[PDB]
Amino acid sequence: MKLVIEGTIVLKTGMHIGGSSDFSAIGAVASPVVRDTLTRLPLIPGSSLKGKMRYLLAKELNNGILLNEPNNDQDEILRLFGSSEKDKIRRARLKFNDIKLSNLAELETFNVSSTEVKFENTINRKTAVANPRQIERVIAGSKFDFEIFYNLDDIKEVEKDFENIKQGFDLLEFDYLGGHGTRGSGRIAFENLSVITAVGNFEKINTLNEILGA
Amino acid sequence: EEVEVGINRLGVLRADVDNLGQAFINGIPDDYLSISRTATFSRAMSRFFKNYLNQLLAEKSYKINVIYAGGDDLFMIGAWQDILDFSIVLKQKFADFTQNKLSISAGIGMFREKYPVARMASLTGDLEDAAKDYTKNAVTLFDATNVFSWDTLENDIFVKLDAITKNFEKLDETGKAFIYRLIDLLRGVNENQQINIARLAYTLSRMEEKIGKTFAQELYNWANADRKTLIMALEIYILKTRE
């Protein structure tokens, strides 16, 4: 069948991400947040989520280090995320989506915006000559509803595939997501993770759901 | 199916000898004439064609089938990788047979393997007829837009194919998307010029750490100087590096 992974991503701080494609004032924030181009909601691209959980999984699935190539790494990690090696192209079983913001309803109950501006500078360590810049980032407490499709084609490896997509989510829990993460931005968390068959009903849907919501 | 190296394409060849009609309008003059001498020329040319070409295609084991033979009719069909480099040694053998007096107009085209041979022969006879009037010594390569003289072919392309083959097989991460991009910007400079030459300079700069600090300079100056003889050079490099 096909498995649809559904949860939500709350933000604990920050999440500056991306870069537009739009003019900036003298003024004000250059490098703003990457937004929806239609409804002007912030989004984390599924590419950015894919890149960080792929990097964190491929890092952890070796020992905690990696210096290889994206098409030259583990069989499970290519089984999830795909490859383009000239002999074996493993078709990517996972399929992300762009994740636009969800709780604009309750963030307007506080009469706060969707995003803040971060005044943050550089001090020259020789001369103490400052240099300011403004960074736009998303208000902490924002909830993003994300949806991941998983191609149910095998039976022997799905429990293996859902033990390390859960472990990938748990590794990215303890890390940032996009932008100035080592300076304290982009810390996320995951909750209400649920797996649901798209059409029909896979029989081993229960053991996937408790390996997911653990 | 024997040639599992390059593009699976079949080439044919059409040719004739330059200035042959004037050679028989006034064969030998009065003052240095015996009767018997001018016949030896024509029998040497005919026996050269039949016997020498049969022996030449025998000694270097060419995948070439032959139909005609003569100074007005020559039609051979074969693998393109075997009749493209047979044309230069054909030029050399008829050049030093004639002692550099009578030369060759030739026409070579590239065809699908499943193709009507009458259509091939007509199209390549017309291809040579494009190279025939250009008479002068010349060969056209697969289209009327690519007509080269023999020295231009040999010297210019077969060192600007030998340089490309020598350099790009040393590199594991340039061939051949860079060659395709370089071809795409090179074949489109014919209509708009400073745009493509500037993008060419920028992209030769940005590969100068991979293709070579020397090699990008020859690519730039060759694209400035003689770029029709490099677009065909990269094209036949691409065709002989297929699969």
């Binding site: 803040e116 005044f119 001369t127 | -």
Partner: protein, 309 residues
Amino acid sequence: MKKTYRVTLTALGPIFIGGGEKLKKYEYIFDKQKKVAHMIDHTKFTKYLLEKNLLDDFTSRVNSHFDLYDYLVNKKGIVFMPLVKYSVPVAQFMNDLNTFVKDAFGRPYIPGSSLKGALRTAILNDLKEDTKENEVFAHLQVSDSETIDLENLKVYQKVDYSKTAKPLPLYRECLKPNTEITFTVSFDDEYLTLKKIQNALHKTYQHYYIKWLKGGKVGETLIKGVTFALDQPSQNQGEIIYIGGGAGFVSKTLHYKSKNRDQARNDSFDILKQLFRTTYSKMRSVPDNVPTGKHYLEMGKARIKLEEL
């Protein structure tokens, strides 16, 4: 191996982190002389103003600049104050306040980049070739703070003690001392440890004491603020930190390494000399006092609590 730490800053002296918002006399501040400062809304205040015809105090700022703080409000017949977001107390000895960095909910916090830049000051303390391409600080995975309550904010004014404690007219709202705010830092042990950051913090405070506060205390200095304690040798290994609240020129630039009367000479003349001024040994200090004598706390100073997980 990505060792994670619950770094807590106990406020050993008031701390400003700023955020880039300045407030003048009329700007929002209800500094009643009950030792209190109330900052008010931006939207609701102005909405109430033009709903009761804002042109009155638009032009009565013109009538009453400079001094108009609450005398406009308390004698225009509307003394109403739900407009305050929150109130802080004040330390004098009236105006020009810049506020603390907040979240969107108006609840302050120490941003992670501030502590990271403070640590970067207190790590690469060697000769300044450690730079933008330093590979050590690609691994310090510091986080933004726990969002501290509004109750620890109280506004302190800028005062400098060069020869006497001279009160500057700048005010800034700061964390009251002995407020503890936690973080979450992580780093690879292949590049830096607990021991490296521990000893580097200790000897930055050692240099900042023994070359500027020791020389600033053997120059003309009393125990007059009785309380501005020297306080290294009990916590000299206790590795005190200075984060950026007007803590001084020396707390930012690194060049008190190696020696004193070359580097103090070149900065305390020349780097001041490109600004405006001409003065000798030494560079001159930045305290902040509080009340019944004063206490003279050194500004922008905290102590690290490196605890694991």
